[model samples]
Target chain A: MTDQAFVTLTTNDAYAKGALVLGSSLKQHRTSRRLAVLTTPQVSDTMRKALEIVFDEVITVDILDSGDSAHLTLMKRPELGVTLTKLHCWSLTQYSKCVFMDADTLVLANIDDLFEREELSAAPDPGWPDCFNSGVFVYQPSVETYNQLLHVASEQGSFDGGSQGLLNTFFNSWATTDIRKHLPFIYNLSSISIYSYLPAFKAFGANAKVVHFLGQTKPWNYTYDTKTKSVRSMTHPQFLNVWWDIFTTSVVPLLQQFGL
Target chain B: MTDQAFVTLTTNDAYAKGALVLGSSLKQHRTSRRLAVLTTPQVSDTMRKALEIVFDEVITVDILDSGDSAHLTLMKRPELGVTLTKLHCWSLTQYSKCVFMDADTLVLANIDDLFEREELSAAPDPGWPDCFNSGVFVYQPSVETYNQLLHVASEQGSFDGGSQGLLNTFFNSWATTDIRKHLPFIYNLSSISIYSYLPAFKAFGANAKVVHFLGQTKPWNYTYDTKTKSVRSMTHPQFLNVWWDIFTTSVVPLLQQFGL
Candidate 1:
């Protein structure tokens, strides 16, 4: 078994813009591991070409629709679309260990250490303290393990009462039994309840290593802001220049990936 | 079968709040049809209860999740999620006929005569005059017909481009074939492009019996001007006020239901 690990992200192209930023941001952090992205067949050629440059390998996985119960469940429950898509991480069997990042997320620091974690390991979800978020997790993949996870999901609906409900149920043991299994919450910070959950998020959110937008709106959905150099600048006006640097300045380097 | 009809709208639950307002507005307009709401299981119980009072019948239908090959195709192609969810309107067979309305919509006058239209009759989409908006349409129920509609949808991906694309493709020949089938745009007057698509909407919008807000931010989602009583005194100011009133005022009726 190789000690070399991997980092992966997903989007069918409507979200490809986010995936591009994720890949670029990861590169900016200069991680040693290979960077990969998973895309569905519907992704546009332009998006595929864009990702081809950022990702070491851009693998096209047909979004499984059949013999896959979770896919069925998602079709049954449209609200869980993002959660279901996040779970696609488990299908990356090529890597001995890998971390799944949501498309709406941005990497603020080194995440290569994430691959060092063992299977069934992830940061605590900010929205629900006891549960582990699927956004960032270290997992080992095998055909059997992938099939088992799907079976557990299908038979047990391990989504967290939707995806969250089902996931909490499936990972029944993660709540309190193993402290070592818990990735620090800051590793996968989310914005589920930024306003109401401000007190809790603030106390724990400042050191966030990876920020998951994990809701309806994403940074790409917003137009460029000259004041912000990075999406992380959302909370501070001073970082506004940083966000602008990332958005306006990054576009050229991103375009350069195509040798432009 | 009584001549009475039922009308309702849906969006995410946030829209369900507006849906209740739609119910009350219809009641305030003194509609003859039995008013009802079809909502997802996730909608708050409080909201469900409040709507029951204003509505003649509050039918809480779980958004149906039909796991079919076409749906699987759409799952692979997620842009179709909204379109698939919209088709759930076909399953509301409880009412002999229904005028499916989007939650961001409001009724200005009694448009109950809409029920008289046949299985698939609808006005041109206010935004795209060539096609019918999925937001509002008069439909009748027959399991046989519903199955055929589903079959037609499955056979050809339903839409050729957008919602209008799907409906027009399914109807196949509505654009030039039937005059009676071509409803007046005023019946389902979409509000946003009143200036952009003004020639048709303006020539027809004042006669608009219903107003549909099709953008990200809806009237109910915003805080109204407390000092804008003069604005409220204006004829349409109550539209937003009505939406707010429904959400807040829902408490009293809810208390009454619980025997408070």
Candidate 2:
């Protein structure tokens, strides 16, 4: 259990805010597991320091310096830069089991039980259930899988479509095989479901454990009025409110020195 | 094997068009099982006649006229008019097994294999995976279960939300146990998935067996230009194109006498 952790990645300074909130949210719910984050050099030192206070280990990664072969492959295909950065999560071999959450994902409850699931356990994407969403997934950190993923990225590109296309192509059997591998949607609930299917959100939104701020608007984009404590003209802002609450209460205190 | 069938419902004339297309699509794919439909009095004789040629049994249902208890309950709670109509599918004891498809859904491939599944087998809803999409499901006809469902609707009402709420509340354990009961998403794929998670759709859409028009716009709403044969300014119109193809060929010929 000590070797297990929750891992997330932040490539730039803007997304570091998301990583901060996710760490604080997990800490707020009293997680027994350790918290870890992967950072690219682009993250400011102030943001890295903020992550240090919240996360147990703030591991830094540089896609270009990963290896000679991997570096040359990324040099040839610039689009796979983000995909390669995401694959770095598998190199975290210190943890036997880890749940990787996207920087935009907010944890509402203690999801330590994710350790009980085997590798590749994740919720189905709201857009398409056949291909599992890579936003939040339980995986075993392995150098071997990471290397093979890089080889595929080098050889054929992702047979799927986008960033999720790369991972879904690697874990192709997730759709047809053992059902337990399919995590319940509550683990990676998307925000767009609010307007997409309003009635369902009203009924089941209360049970959501992790809220993924999907679409062009992240949680940080919505203007939160601290006095009235309302998001400006935001529909279904309940989840966003919790994000802001933690941001102001916990994350803000850490970033004060940076004048943020 | 012959006792198994595909079942669908159309409460009015607009949805009758959907049912006609679903039957035609299933027929085009050469399903081994029989085809059945549930219609209400609101459907015209001409529409019913059109359905009569495509489906083996055109069952007409009126919620208020089901039975004394069901009729009185629906009278007290008028919003359940559709819910009560939906529950009427369970009373179809003639078929040993049935796969229910909503009128808004279209079949793209033969799905006789669905008969292998037991009652309550269905794909997870794109809006929320915890609850299965009620649009398409594998079920066994049971009078006892039907009466109990009616009693629950009469007493506590549906525990979940929307029309899916009624059925989901009844089949409460679906999300927890027996993974095999969870049908693959291909069986009841939603249209919203195309844009919601475009990459996954681009890769996996070719294998879609059934498409649920989950939004307000149905296939019939899109103006199909028979000359050039395209849906006007519609993004991700590939699936909608298939719906128009079957409608123009198989379904249109039957509706010709009515000048449709």
Candidate 3:
């Protein structure tokens, strides 16, 4: 049996909510593996409680101290704290194999099949398809890997606005040959690109199992418009209901624990 | 003299560039007041030099030690660090009446008339006329007033997003009973709103002396669309030139300070 596992990390409380949804959504799909969260001490008591309910284990870890490429990028662009916190996924050593998912991604089904992919597995970026998307990826943890990540980070600062650059740089090998290493877009579908590339999305994006939000827009940022008649109608209405239900259902276990 | 003076505040090296421009602009207009800039230690050596050339006094202040309502608000809502930093102006008790302009705001004309205005006096919000804009406002600084502000903030949080809510809540009386308290809208203008409420702004927004980028949409966010000649063409033409001009000519005295 493989010691493979799934792990998500979040330092901010708001992102912790997203992590909870990701965890619970996996449970709803009934994936049979250990689920864990890597977090910082600053997360609120309420959020920590909620994460505890959804994740099989809530592990406290320092994200900025990881000494990875993303951390270096963050030090260069130190103001992007949200991006820095999101990149702190490299330190999870308890899991033999792990999948890092952004706080905003929602799983529509059991995407456990993604675990079959090897380390450094990820779908192409939505904006620039040639580059891998950092929002979701398959990884294995080790102190050496963590140190190597730090070395890569120090060598290359963030490239995009935040963590995306660092991760993209560390996994630069993905850009060259070897098409087989590319994961299907279904694992890391992005909605932000739909505004400009609707045709491509309509053709290739119909079957995305995990929807990721890579830009500033989020379900919480946009208000529901009655005139639009959209379920999650702001930007990417495709996964709105799933996200809300995941967020709501994810909180229920915690609320029940509190008897609230 | 009533001991009332004029003040501006900036926290980081980047925003300190804004502060230098602000100080220089105020000096160019030659207003009769003690012009000062409250800067943090993070201001680069060159920024400190630039600030000294423009303002009569460049004081260093710690955000954590502001000891004001806004600082307390920041403590309560740690998520609002960017918002709370603006509140550092409250500690400027040295100024009896002061106008807090965002780092991005540029004064096209002398605004000494703003000093004559009373505390809490501000132009209508570009987004919502019912509320006053925090970007520019005349205020009186005192520890008692600071305490009252802290108490109010502790009870009710900012309503909209940042300082707008806190300012609106404290000056709630403006919306109901005060007419003379309302400053003219032309005092603060944004180019985007020109198209949004063209008739109203065209009718009333001409002769704007100061311009503010009020939302996530700013002059810096958009690039010039070589194809579209309309204002939409340059969605947000980087206002850096105007900002720079304001800095070199209006905000401060010279170029040698910015490492030019």
Candidate 4:
């Protein structure tokens, strides 16, 4: 567990809620590896503690306020700020390998096998298959790699405005070079895919191990009716219900302790 | 029914076999509209006669080597030659409205309702959801549109070296502006999608109305065992079986008459 871990990041409380659900889902699936999260000051203390309860390590990385060397470049392109923060996963030298998943993503099945994959392995983005989505990726931890990523971010602002493009630019060969690096889409299924290519989603959605809430509406954004066990008016609200069910059962009681 | 139609294109005998299956499937499903096909000199006279038997109109247009305005662009990027040949569908002003399906695409159910869609209506490509896959599309037939398509093809050349890119660029607003213009994926389910995202295909494959054999292997390319009703060594050979079934039952007799 110390040698390999599953990592995530959350900048604000909204995403912190998602991160809580993500952690709960991973635990529910019985992950053998450790859980870690990189959080910022924007997360409430209660939520941070909630993460600490579920995650083995709760890393507080203030890339923006810490006045790190990457801060100056982040000031130029504030969008890269989160991109720089995400790069901190590479700095977790305590672990030899790590799989970083976005806070808004949920694991439905045990993905412990992801540890077997080499560094920089990820699923393709539904919007653009040529570019791998940075939401969930397997990577190695190294301070040297982290510093180099920061240098790349400072030199070339991301093409798609965030970590996905920046990381794609860095790992440019991920698309064409190696088949091993292209993880199956099931590992990181984009929720918007239900709309993007509904028929394919209908065919393959059942095999989805990790459902990513990629669009504007996160799982926490939906109003889930506990009595009905449903999200009103939203088609295929089952995934949202899964997130909300975990939230109410595992995360709510923890939040209540802080009178949140 | 007389004014509206479904169209397809065939460049060679192998594709003509697919076109025959496509026409048979459309008729089997009982489309209210008419059927038409565009062919090149590559098709045999006997096959042309066979097409005349199934299609309401079998139009042949030799765009390339005919000294068309697009001849130079076709020479620069010979790949665009097929794209220019496809542009002939727009000149099909005989029909007020038309749905153009690729020769390799087979209709499983009636899609007469597609006539309700406007020009440039198509399903998003499985590989790139941002750009519509031109395999199946609805359009209003006009000589003006055909001329403009030719001009665009000659000036810029296709980014993808095919009609998919040229048409996507011509209808650049297809991705962002209108939702209705984006047709559902079942309308043109890329067959490789079974491999691209197998789980989704398994989930929704039953609802697929049109299946487009998107990869290098068209249905005719597969060796179908008529006794077992299967294609050997292929995963999810059900779609191929469906195409073969149609070809063996309906199209085979016609080809047999042609001594094919």
TM-score of each: 0.44, 0.93, 0.46, 0.56
- What does the lDDT read for residue B196 in candidate 4? 62
Off by over 4 Å in 3: A63-77, A80-88, A222-236, A250-253, B1-260
Residue B77 CA displacement from its true place in model 1, Å: 59
* Evaluation by TM-score, superior candidate among 2 and 3: 2
What TM-score does model 3 score on chain A? Answer: 0.83
Error of 2 at A2 (Å): 2.3
Ranked candidates, highest TM-score first: 2, 4, 3, 1
Better of 3 and 4 by TM-score: 4
**TM-score of candidate 4 to 2 decimals:** 0.56
Model 1 complex DockQ against the native? 0.01
Give per-residue CA lDDT, model 1, range B1-260, as digits (tens).
35345656454667676777777678777777777666656777766766677677665443334544235545555665556555656665776787777777878888877777775667654312334566677777556655665565556554333355566666755533454554555666555544443333323346667777666667765765545532222224444565566555653355466654
Chain A TM-score per candidate?
Answer: 0.79, 0.95, 0.83, 0.96
True contacts kept of each: 0.00, 0.61, 0.00, 0.07
List model 3 lDDT by residue over A1-260, tens digit each: 13666778777777777788788888888888878787887888788887877777887755467554455555665666665555455566666778888778888888888777778877765323335677788887776766675565556545554666667667777644344445666777766655444543544456678888656766556554444434543444657666765555456467567656
- Indicate the DockQ of the complex predicted as candidate 4: 0.05
Best candidate (score: lDDT)? 2
Q: Which predicted model would earn the best TM-score? A: 2
In candidate 3, position B212 carries an lDDT of: 71
Q: Mind giving the per-residue lDDT tens digits that candidate 1 earns over A38-129?
A: 78767888678878887887876543566554577566555655555556666667777777676666777887777657777776553223
Q: Which ten residues in a row have the lowest lDDT in candidate 1 chain B?
A: B229-238
* lDDT digits (tens) for residues B96-191 of candidate 2: 999999988888888889889999899988767778889999999989999988888888676553458888888988876677788889899888
Poorest 10 consecutive residues by lDDT, candidate 4 chain B: B195-204
